[PDB]
Amino acid sequence: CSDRKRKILNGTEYIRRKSSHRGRIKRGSQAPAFKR
Amino acid sequence: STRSISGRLFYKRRPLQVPKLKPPNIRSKWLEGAPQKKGICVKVRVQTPRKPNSGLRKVARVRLSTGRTVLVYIPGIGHNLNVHSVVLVRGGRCKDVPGCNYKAVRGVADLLPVKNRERKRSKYGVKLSSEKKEWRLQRWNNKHLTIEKDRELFNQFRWMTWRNEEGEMRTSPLADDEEVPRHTQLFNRWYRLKMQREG
Amino acid sequence: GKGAVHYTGTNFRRVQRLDIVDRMRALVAQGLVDAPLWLSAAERAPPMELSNLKLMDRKVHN
Amino acid sequence: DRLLPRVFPLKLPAHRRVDPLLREYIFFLHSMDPARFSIRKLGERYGLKERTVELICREFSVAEFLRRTELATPYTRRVSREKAVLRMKEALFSLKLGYDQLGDEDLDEQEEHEFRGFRSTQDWIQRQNIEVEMMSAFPLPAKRNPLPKRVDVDVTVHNTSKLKVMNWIDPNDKVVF
Amino acid sequence: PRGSHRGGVFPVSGLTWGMNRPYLKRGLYQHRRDHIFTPRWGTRTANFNPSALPDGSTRRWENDAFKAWPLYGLPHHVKLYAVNEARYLVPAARCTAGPEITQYILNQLDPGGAGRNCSGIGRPDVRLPLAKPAAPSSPDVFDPFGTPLSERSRIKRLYNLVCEADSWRVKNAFPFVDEKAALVRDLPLAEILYCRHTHRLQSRRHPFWIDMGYKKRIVRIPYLYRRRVAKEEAQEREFG
Amino acid sequence: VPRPLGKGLKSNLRYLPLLYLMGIDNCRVSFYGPSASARWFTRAKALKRALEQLQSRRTLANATGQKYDLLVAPGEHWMHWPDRWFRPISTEYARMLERIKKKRPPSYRRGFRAAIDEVIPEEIRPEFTPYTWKSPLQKWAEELKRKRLTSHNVYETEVFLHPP
RNA sequence: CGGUACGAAGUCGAAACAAGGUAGUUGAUGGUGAACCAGUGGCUGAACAAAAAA
RNA sequence: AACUAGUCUUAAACACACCGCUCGUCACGUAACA
RNA sequence: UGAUUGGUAUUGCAUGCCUGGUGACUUA
RNA sequence: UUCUUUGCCUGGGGGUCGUUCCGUACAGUUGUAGGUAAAAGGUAUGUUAGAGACUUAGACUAGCGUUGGAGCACAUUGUUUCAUUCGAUAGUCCACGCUCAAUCUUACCAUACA
RNA sequence: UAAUACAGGGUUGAACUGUGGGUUAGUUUCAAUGCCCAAGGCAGAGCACUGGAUUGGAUACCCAGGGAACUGUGCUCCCAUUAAUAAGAAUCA
RNA sequence: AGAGGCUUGAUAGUACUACCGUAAGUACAUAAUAUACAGUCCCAGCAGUAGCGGUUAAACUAUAGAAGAGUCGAGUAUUAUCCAUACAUACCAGGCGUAAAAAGCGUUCAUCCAAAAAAU
RNA sequence: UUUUAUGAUCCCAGGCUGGUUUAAUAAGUCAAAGUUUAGCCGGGAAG
RNA sequence: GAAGUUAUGGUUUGAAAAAAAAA
RNA sequence: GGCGAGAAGGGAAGUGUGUUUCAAAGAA
RNA sequence: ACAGUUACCGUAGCUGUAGAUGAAUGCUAAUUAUAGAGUAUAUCUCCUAUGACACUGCAUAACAUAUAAAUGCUCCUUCCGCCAAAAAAAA
Fold this sequence. Notes:
The structure is cut from a larger assembly and holds chains A, B, C, D, E and F.
Chain A: H1 2-10, H2 12-16
Chain C: H1 20-30, H2 39-44, H3 50-54
Chain E: E1 43-44, E2 60-61, H1 65-68, H2 75-94, H3 99-109, H4 156-168, H5 189-193, H6 207-239
Antiparallel strand pairs in E: 1-2
Helix pairs in contact in E: 2-3, 2-4
Chain B binds 10 RNA strands through helix 1, strand 4, helix 2, helix 3 and helix 4.
Protein name (chain C): Small ribosomal subunit protein mS23
Family (chain C): Belongs to the mitochondrion-specific ribosomal protein mS23 family.
Organism (chain C): Toxoplasma gondii
């Protein structure tokens, strides 16, 4: 969470991680969504 | 304090939860656990130290035998390193130069030892010169000095029964123009012993 | 870390109450003070233990 | 006051405190008739210990051998710094108080409660300095006694001018034959 | 360990180093024994003997020698032992419970019995310095023969305490008030390390090199003394 | 940390004087100290809280009602000889008590060594009392020693061996 | 390729810290040489102003 | 109703103390990853 | 009616002495 | 620093065939280079606030007079000269150093003597 | 957040019951706004954008107008993600 | 100096095995040296984080800078390796309001623990 | 029907074990894991 | 000869076979 | 003709190697 | 387990210092001690002793536990050790 939340805050995850939340710039999910 | 070994999987969980600080000597990771590595100077230049310090630091980009290229500081005053020069490189961090974590061993390969150096010679590969060796022996030729208390005591106690180097005896106390004689069996004993042992 | 979170621990101080007779006996024995004149009378009439009697007060519903 | 530089009396051996003439007399008696003038009897008469008498006899015999063979004088035998300092100590002791004319030791020391170093202030087997116990007017359970350690020893069984044979003994071996 | 000391080097005596301190620089200075407590248990002589005959008149005892080489059994020792024996026997003397408890207290005060050496104070056949004389120990039973009571030997523990007390015995104005003074004195490390020897550092240096250092000093110290004295004398001659 | 009785104080020489001021004995004191901005401001509170923990055998024994005996001094704190042992009596009341009480036979094992009464100081010196069994050399040495000790020249401190 | 870290201080503005002169910042967005701006929903890690009772 | 000197309260990322601190594009060389 | 040991050259961002402006100066 | 069980943290910070799975897909991603001796929480003061309140102490106001409009004098600025010496430069420079310069004062310039 | 319909939870009591629990992934019901999709579509207000001003200058703050978004058993959980600083036992009258 | 290596700006208690203030290399010889000095001037250079060097440096270079000073010594220093001294790898022995850290709120499986601990 | 989040299916890297003394009230076995003569083990073939 | 014997690192990318059906 | 002879093996193997706890009879 | 990290307190890292190595590098040594005095000049001194006191690690000198990485080329291995009690030297 320290380095993990730091990556979230600086936005690496925003770019590199798929999101079932979608958005027009973020990567999307083409498979049914489930909590991981 | 034993909240970290709860449950059944403590023996696999807790050993994972530990400090994760950098290794003590990770600054020299490109030596690959070796005391020192040989490298070829790909670039030789002078860099500007970080402020507030000012001046020029002699540095070289060197391609180690491992193939990695690293920045190496050239300790000492003056050097002859050029491009395509082979240098032995050890772990040493020059705080001024950004990213510099290795130094060059003086007197090894094409890096000549520092000139006009007489202190910390073992840290710059300077041998003990013949002049220095001769002086480290001729230095202890003891000098004879008096404080007039020697004169008083000699004229009060010693002149009565005294023997010269040749064995001659004294017949009068010390004059005003005569220095206090040396003790034939105690003065300069160590230096005389060394000279006589040599020959 | 934290500060005064150690209940039943270093939050409280478990130190003895040393009255006049105890403190003066210690001072005289260690020789830091010359024996006062009243010390004999104080020793022969020691002060009572007030903390123990204090612990006997009980809250009562009205 | 623990920081005051106090001066305490210096300790000296009894075999160096007794008078040299008494030493010579003891040496003569022992070297003449070691049976009638036993070490125990000499110590009993002259208020010394058997070890002290033995040391006196050894030292006097060495000195007499050296003197009569003309090997070294009492001031040319090479010795250690500690023994030179001991000689100085006894010299000053004699110059101040004078040599004792009789021994003052005890033949068989007694069981006396005295501080004899930090090792003497604790029960090493129990690993405790304080014996915590309850108050009762009736018998209490006895304490478990220790059992003596069973350690190996070597006992010589046959010695000659060429070979020494000694039996290695293991006190735990049950079948002994 | 090996090699030179890497880190902070402090004098073993506990004295600070500085421009106007006993030591100029950092170091152990274990050879400097003038900064530790070395009692003088011997004698002392002078550089010169004025008398025309070598009678050893300069030789004299050192002050610490009287504590180093004591003498026991002196009259003040005897008097102190007598007073302390009276006070120490007070309990058994004034016990009025019974012979059993009296013997118990006596044994506690001075252990004795078969195979032991005691003072025999409580024995019926030993004389004591009673205040009110009484029968030694009614008319029917006594000792028909003379049989004088034997003397009582001393209590060894108490006598040793009395004798050893000597080692622990310790021997208007210009009204100028001090304002730059300390209210509670001060307790430096040197005051401890001077006399409490077990707190000091044990040397890792070779005794050979210790002896070599002593031999070097014996030859070099006078030269430095003469160097500075010659500087001063040359300056005075130039001024003259 | 406790140390065996006799070793004394152990600590950094920087703080040995502090140990001597505190007056502790037979123990080793170690500081691991804060790594924050302060060094002694909070270390003082830590040391005070440490010193507040120390108890004594007397404190423990009084609090508990049990025995906490130091092996080099057993019974030092709890043993009390009753005052009923040392109750002096006058002559008339002594006669009355001897009349009222019932006698008990004296046991030699427990009764021996009980012939003592009020004592007054007197100087003795039984180290030099001649006896028949003493050997001639022992008698000679003891006589010389007693003469030396009782001499009038004792207590005469003369720094010079060869006096003026 | 786009981005990133070090040295340098050059041009352009003045986005934040005071109500920072339009409160800040956040989720996903739209727009813009640059910091940024706008709407919407969150938070406070924000202010201003602030009741007597008929 | 405004200003200076105070004096008081609040806020502060200022403490060389708002003539403070401080953001970014562009330009400029040495590099790692990609 | 009794003369003298160079520089009014730089450096007030080396200072002494001396000034300007603003602040203070409270006790029993 | 009473006890039970899950979740997470290791200074700051940066870049980044496994699938007989539908493949630019699914699943998965804090971590390796390059920088670093700091970074960041609070309380205590000061300073500031295009923040607020207050005393009404000065400021305003009111009264007596000015100055910016014209002439002269001083200083300063611009110009010029071989030189028109120099300093002072918001308040705290500008009739100031210089409480008085035709000679001298003079420290500026020109000439010729050392 | 009026009434009505259908469901909880909480509180109080009676009965029943009788260690039947505390925590929880290879678990999945729900969950602001935005975005994708679908609906409708001009009550209000309102990105981008247009033009009326201020500014050396503004791509803004101010004004007028405005086809993006504002109601879904869908897709769906990114967050300064919802009653707080995880849940339970113990210590208090 | 019977000998060399390293230090010669501050900073580290220089540990520790027997002794545990119970003594003398105690006195004389025998009293000291370096935040004295010289060369360089944000250069050359040094250093361990901090830092020093701005033309009068106990911080760079120099030890005939003096028979200089501290330590170890036939050796000594640099680099490297670690279970790298309590950068407690935190069981002994760290944390999750504000400084890194409580999952968005919840329902459960397995494990774990509780209530008849130890014994049965 | 058999395995499987107590890690099945399924890649790469590594044979395991012992060594007496061992300072500190840190030891009566060196005390989660650090070794050094050694212990145990490590296919088959003239077809 | 037998019976018991915690896995670790490379960040890892959870179901694998058999059987049934298929042609 | 008879005995002995591995340059004293690190080439295989992860739930393996080894370790710990055991057990092992001819002349029946 | 001590110190340091620019007001103070708390987080948190960082810096020096211990120990186990003994692996590389720098400077440095090595064939280990030939030889055996007396008046070593003075001062002092009842262990009277060339005592204080002051070149002889100076000697029968010593010299230790674990190890032997990778690639290429050339050459070598063929009469291994004992037994004739393997019926031999043989009253």
